[PDB]
């Protein structure tokens, strides 16, 4: 069941004594006219605070259970009134599922209303008053016990009548102390417009007039991002699907620059025999981008494919192609037996078998000098102890899987202190208009309401500005259409009211608003809500603007007429 907590749940936030003062404080209070969950056993959360109340007759209700896990293996606060006193414990007790160990703190101390407030260290406020279904009226809860137990609490339960629970919320209240220091009344600063007016005036009565209380702001709904359409993509079909590949010693190198570096082709293509990345993720390549992309394409045998990697040694890793110890790129190699192997053995691809010194990374040596393996200089004779380093490859279709040719392409990224123009695609959502959006076009970020504009930009212009150097219009990069930008409506809130000595019925005016962003009268001052519009004209009672004056008259309600000049 649910019940309406009229005015209860108000406590003293401090010790200090204030006499005849309307103090305004922000703390966790029970919101006025809230919904108290009526029970009559179950456990409950302890998010930020509780207004546990009760309506006992002969001490039917006994105590409270607190903690996180509500059982052993975790500390749990414990308060029960066993007809003698309240025993407070913080030991990891073994509570049953329905009652009625490493201790760190211990303490042994329907016409009733035992109102209690609990919040965390742990503080308890209590006030017992006779009553006659929460009663209407006001009573403050003086603090009764404070306990320095410091237990993390999230749930609570009850022992054992009327058994209500309220929840505390961080709301600002205006507390009416009396001459003796007793809080005799309070105002919730967010219950309704009249309560806001009382809070902003720091008074429990308000005289006739129009008072500005708060600022109304339209918040954006969705973010929009638009970037120019996909331009010319980087060349990846003339490299990965080229007709003829180069020999490994004379590996074909191509520098990719000034284009969009889409990698999607290397992702959907499932025919790659190897896609391995070093230093960077195989998928996070599009995010970070550099000046140039280098494609090194050549053909080797399957037995030496594993040698295309940093820290590799072999007939290929040091005589035909070497990778640095640290590498910024990825290697891709796929079987090309049907493209590089012919009948009778394909011997059109070569490699280097003899070399004086290991090749420096990213160095190509096409020299075909005669190697001197012994001590007799050759002088280009190709005889005993003199060899031709350019060994051919035995590529035939009848080779095994490992002896078939493999087309290898290596991608290297180099970044220096220079403009970088080679990256992936950017975001580009659908265009929405007539709504306060958080736009971000090709470079500029702002909040506004885009509308189909009327200005005629120049061919090369992408921006719009006013005299105050404020962004006004934008040309959409995808569809070359100019858009007007108007900030989404803002302004102030004013509460038009006759005196509380007369009534508590107020009318709210939103300044400079078209009534579509908040019985509803639209004026030049703004959207007037809660005031009738009369076709008569009387003397001005409460000014509004542009000749509109609202007044409280005949039952009786608040009207909004156009004032008469005598």
């Amino acid at each position: 069941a649910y019940t309406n907590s009229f005015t209860r749940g108000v406590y003293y936030p401090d010790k200090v004594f204030r006499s005849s003062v309307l103090h305004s404080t922000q703390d966790l209070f029970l919101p006025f006219f809230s919904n108290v969950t009526w029970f009559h056993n179950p456990v409950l959360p302890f998010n930020d605070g509780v207004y546990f109340a009760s309506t006992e007759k002969s001490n039917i209700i006994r105590g409270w259970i607190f903690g996180t896990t509500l059982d052993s293996k975790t500390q749990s606060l414990l308060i029960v009134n066993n007809a003698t006193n309240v025993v407070i414990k913080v030991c990891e007790f073994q509570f049953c599922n329905d009652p009625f160990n490493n201790c760190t703190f211990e303490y042994v101390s329907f016409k009733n209303l035992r109102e209690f407030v609990f919040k965390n260290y742990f503080k308890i406020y209590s006030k017992h008053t006779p009553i006659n279904d929460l009663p209407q009226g006001f009573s403050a809860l003086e603090p009764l016990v404070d306990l320095p137990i410091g237990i993390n609490i999230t749930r609570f339960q009850t022992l054992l009548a009327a058994y209500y629970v309220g929840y505390l919320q961080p709301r600002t209240f205006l507390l009416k102390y009396n001459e003796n220091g007793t809080i005799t009344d309070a105002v919730d600063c967010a219950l309704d417009p009249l309560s806001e007016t009382k809070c902003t005036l720091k008074s429990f009565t308000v005289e006739k007039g129009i008072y500005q209380t708060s600022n109304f702001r339209v918040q954006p709904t969705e973010s929009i991002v638009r970037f120019p359409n996909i331009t010319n993509l980087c060349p990846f079909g003339e490299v990965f699907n080229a007709t003829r590949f180069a020999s490994v010693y004379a590996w074909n190198r191509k520098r990719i620059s000034n284009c969009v570096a889409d990698y999607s082709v290397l992702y959907n293509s499932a025919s790659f025999s190897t896609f391995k990345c070093y230093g960077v993720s195989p998928t996070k390549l599009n995010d970070l981008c550099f000046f140039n992309v280098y494609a090194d394409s050549f053909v080797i045998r399957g037995d030496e494919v594993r040698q295309i990697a940093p820290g590799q040694t072999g007939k290929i890793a040091d005589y035909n192609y070497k990778l640095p110890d640290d590498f910024t790129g990825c290697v891709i190699a796929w079987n090309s037996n049907n493209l590089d192997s012919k009948v009778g053995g394909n011997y059109n691809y070569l490699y280097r078998l003899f070399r004086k010194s290991n090749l420096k990374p990213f160095e190509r040596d096409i020299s075909t000098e005669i190697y001197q393996a012994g001590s007799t200089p050759c002088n280009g004779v190709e005889g005993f102890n003199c060899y031709f380093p350019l060994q051919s490859y035995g590529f035939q279709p009848t080779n095994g899987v490992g002896y078939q040719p493999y087309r290898v392409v290596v991608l290297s990224f180099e970044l220096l202190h220079a403009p970088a123009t080679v990256c992936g695609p950017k975001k580009s959502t659908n265009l929405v208009k007539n709504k306060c959006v958080n736009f971000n076009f090709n470079g500029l970020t702002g909040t506004g309401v885009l509308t189909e504009s009327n200005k005629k930009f120049l061919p090369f212009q992408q921006f719009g500005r006013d005299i105050a150097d404020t962004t006004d219009a934008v040309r959409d990069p995808q569809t070359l259409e100019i858009l007007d930008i108007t900030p989404c409506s803002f302004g102030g809130v004013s509460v038009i009211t006759p005196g509380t000595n007369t009534s508590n019925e107020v009318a709210v005016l939103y300044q400079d608003v078209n009534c579509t962003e908040v019985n509803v009268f639209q004026t030049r001052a703004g959207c007037l809500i809660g005031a009738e519009h009369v076709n008569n004209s009387y003397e001005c009672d409460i000014p509004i603007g542009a000749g509109i004056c609202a007044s409280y008259q005949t039952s009786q309600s608040i009207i909004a007429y156009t004032m008469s000049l005598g």
Partner: nanobody
Amino acid sequence: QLVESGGGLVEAGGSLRLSCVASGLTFSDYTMAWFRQVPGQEREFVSHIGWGGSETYYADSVKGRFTISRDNAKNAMYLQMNELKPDDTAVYYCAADRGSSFYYVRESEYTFWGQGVTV
């Protein structure tokens, strides 16, 4: 090369912790994985961890259950289980490689392989 620890009979619902220690690798510029062996059937992939542990993936039949981690201070990484279904009882193999691959599910893309955990 890759010495691994952990494994044993479980209570069919508890938790277990597996480790794989590299004894001859720098472990700071290498990427590992976890693969599963079942008799009478092919080799299965389960888990994978990148450099440091900021980019990790998991199998579709194991996602959300097991957690992977690595730490360079001891040249080893930790795999912790949380469900241990009576269907995942199999042979555990620790792999490693210099880099990370797009075809990270393929067994051929892990040159280094460790010993086996108890079935």
